[PDB]
Amino acid sequence: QLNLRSLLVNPEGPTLMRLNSVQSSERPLFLVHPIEGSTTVFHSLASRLSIPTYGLQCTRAAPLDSIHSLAAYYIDCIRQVQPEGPYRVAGYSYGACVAFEMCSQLQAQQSPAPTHNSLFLFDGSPTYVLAYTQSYRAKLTPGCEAEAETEAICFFVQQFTDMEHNRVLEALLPLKGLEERVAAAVDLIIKSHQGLDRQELSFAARSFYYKLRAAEQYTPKAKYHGNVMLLRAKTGDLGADYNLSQVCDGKVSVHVIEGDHRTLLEGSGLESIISIIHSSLA
Numbered sequence: 001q002l003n004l005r006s007l008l009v010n011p012e013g014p015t016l017m018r019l020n021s022v023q024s025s026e027r028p029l030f031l032v033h034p035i036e037g038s039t040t041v042f043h044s045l046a047s048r049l050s051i052p053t054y055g056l057q058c059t060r061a062a063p064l065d066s067i068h069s070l071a072a073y074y075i076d077c078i079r080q081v082q083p084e085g086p087y088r089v090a091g092y093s094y095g096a097c098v099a100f101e102m103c104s105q106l107q108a109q110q111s112p113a114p115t116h117n118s119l120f121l122f123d124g125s126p127t128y129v130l131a132y133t134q135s136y137r138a139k140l141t142p143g144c145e146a147e148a149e150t151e152a153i154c155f156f157v158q159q160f161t162d163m164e165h166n167r168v169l170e171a172l173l174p175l176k177g178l179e180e181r182v183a184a185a186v187d188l189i190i191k192s193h194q195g196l197d198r199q200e201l202s203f204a205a206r207s208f209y210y211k212l213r214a215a216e217q218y219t220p221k222a223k224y225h226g227n228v229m230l231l232r233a234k235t236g237d238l239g240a241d242y243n244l245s246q247v248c249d250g251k252v253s254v255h256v257i258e259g260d261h262r263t264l265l266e267g268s269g270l271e272s273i274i275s276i277i278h279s280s281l282a
Ligand SMILES: CCN(CC)S(=O)(=O)c1ccc(-c2csc(Cc3ccccc3F)n2)cc1
Pocket: 034, 035, 093, 094, 124, 128, 129, 132, 133, 134, 136, 137, 147, 148, 149, 150, 151, 152, 153, 155, 209, 212, 213, 216
């Protein structure tokens, strides 16, 4: 596909970035990236929202040892613009899991006072990401980390080139460790796209593996007491609430939205989401 710079983050970029020019005292919406770590997917939404909108992007500054560490770091970044709650948080896809942990940590900090934080999940959940990682893992040799590394880096290379799965798998499988798999992957992508930045790609390939690892290993400590809204694609089985009932003990509202996983933040889907958010800020 095109705009490959949407699959890449500036590793020396800021974690928190304005995504619209709305200047007002109304509390901002913070939007958490999909797995590629960029805020690109949110530009249409942000340009249409009548409240100040920021994006959270995944730079060299982000800790990826756990979803818990990542979420704590994104809360600290948010407080550089909004020191005090309540907080409006959304996440898309991989970002849905991360935003959920941020709201849990904010709940814990204030316990037992009820927070009036708002959480929106764009087509994912703690479980939606787990389901994906468990699928890819369950077609591999168990206990064979080299095969997991190979699988992750192969998927990354396939988002930049049209190379067949098996020929990328063959090239990466016999290599000594992650850093060699990363170096081989950047050389393959550079061949297809000679002007892309080697350090951007290196950071993107390595972090892709670490992001997947953090997501597998994630389970909320306790359940989220706040009320959540899920905005899931009309065109996707994992369940109607993507298993949020298992991790929330508050009001879980599900809206089905025109489009698929990739298109629901655009076109007809985007109109519905904008109307839902704009009324839902109430
Ligand atoms: C929410 C679902 N998403 C799809 C858009 S997503 O969030 O970004 C998403 C989720 C998983 C995978 C994937 C590829 S290989 C894989 C298995 C795996 C785990 C850990 C380490 C190495 C691995 F090899 N897991 C890729 C993408």
